[PDB]
Structure formats: structure tokens, C-alpha cells
Design a protein around this nucleic acid. Structure first.
Length: 146
RNA sequence: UCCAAGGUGAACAGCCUCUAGUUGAUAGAAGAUAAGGGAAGUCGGUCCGUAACUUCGGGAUAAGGAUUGGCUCUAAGGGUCGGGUAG
């Protein structure tokens, strides 16, 4: 959006727009920016929306400006879906009890916020300094505010 | 045919006054109420006590007396500088 708003860039010859994860880009948060981005670009074009949950963005696909569209749905136990019901104050401990006991090559642990990612990363590193968990595990943190 | 102050009224009205005009018109003296009866008459009888609310802007970001720190992704968030031990 910042790039297209610069006067040095002309958008008149564009003839192809693709939105990957189009259900996420038409979300309530992203709709403000994508509306402007599509506003700058010419209306007569070919649009391709691609998303693994494209059905959820039900009537918001026409906000993109489809002209001659064809919806496409592709369908096929690959993986296990479990859940644990525990007291919150134990939750982090349970995480540790999974990291040093389960068998894996890569484990991805999701956190709600970025500050939580940094804070718990530092505390788990401190625990590993004291050898609370003993394994050939290398721990990284990656949030989107970096 | 032109000009046209204010206050009360808190209902055009009426009342009072500011500026400005008058003191003109022979002079002196000496409708209302009603006891009892009630048509017997005549042709004809706005202010005291409650409660909720309630005006303009600026603010964005969950609050606004408290210990303020407040979501995920996504353009920019003042400038600059700086990293070990050895040969």
C-alpha cells in the first residue's frame, strides 16, 4: 500500500491480482488495507483468491471485485488432535513435561502474545540453565514484532 | 406614504417607562351592595415535594483514584555510533 501510494509508481497496466490466504486478507483487520490496495488498481482485471478456509469468507469475496468467477472446492487419520484439561497455574509445567518426555524432531509451541513469547522464552532458558529439563533441545522465539 | 427604545406580561393583548413632545378644552361655589324567599314579576327570565435525564468541542485504542502495564498479523515510529582472544 505504501509503495502504490508513491506517485512514482503507475498501476494502470496491471492485469492480474492474486490474494493468498484470501480469507485472512478479507478479515475485519485486513479489509481496511486491502480495500485501498484494490481501490488503487484497475477494476478490469483477473483475480485469484486462494485459501484453505475460503468458505468462511462467505460473502466478503465479492468485496475483492470478482468479474467472471468460478468457486473451486477440493477435498480428500493423518494427524492426532488431543487436548488436556488442567489448572492454569500448572500449564507451563505441563509444557515442560511434554518437551523432555515426548518424541519429536520439531515442536512448535504457540503463545497468545509477543511479550508472553519473550517472557516465557527467557524463563525456560533460565530453567534449562539449572538443568531442569535435560535433552538435546534448542529453543527459539519468533514473534511478529521483531 | 417613510422611521420606530426598553421592561413586564411569561397567551396578539393590556400596563409602565427612556428620547421627544404636551398641560389644549370659559372659570368659581355649592356601576355596586343588600337579611328571608328564589321568577311568586312580565304576553314572554402558572405554583410547593420527587426522581431519572439533559448542551458544545476534543478526543481513537479496556478503565479513569488507582498497583496502568492492555490482543494477533500488517507501511513509517528522530539522527548517529559501538562487538571478543591470539599471531
Amino acid at each position: 500500500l505504501d509503495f502504490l501510494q508513491m506517485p512514482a509508481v503507475k498501476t494502470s497496466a496491471c492485469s492480474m491480482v492474486v490474494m493468498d490466504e484470501a480469507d485472512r486478507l478479507l478479515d475485519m483487520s485486513f479489509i481496511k488495507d486491502t480495500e485501498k490496495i484494490l481501490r488503487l488498481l484497475p477494476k478490469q482485471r483477473r483475480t485469484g483468491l486462494f485459501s484453505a478456509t475460503m468458505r468462511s469468507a462467505g460473502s466478503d469475496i465479492f468485496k475483492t471485485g470478482l468479474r467472471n468467477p468460478v468457486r473451486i472446492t477440493v477435498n480428500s487419520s493423518s494427524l492426532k488432535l488431543n487436548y488436556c484439561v488442567v489448572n492454569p497455574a500448572e500449564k507451563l509445567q505441563l509444557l515442560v513435561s511434554i518437551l523432555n518426555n515426548y518424541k519429536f524432531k520439531k515442536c512448535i509451541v504457540y503463545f497468545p502474545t509477543c511479550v508472553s513469547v519473550s517472557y516465557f522464552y527467557s524463563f525456560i532458558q533460565y530453567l534449562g540453565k539449572r538443568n531442569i529439563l535435560v535433552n538435546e533441545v534448542e529453543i527459539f522465539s519468533l514473534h511478529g514484532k521483531l
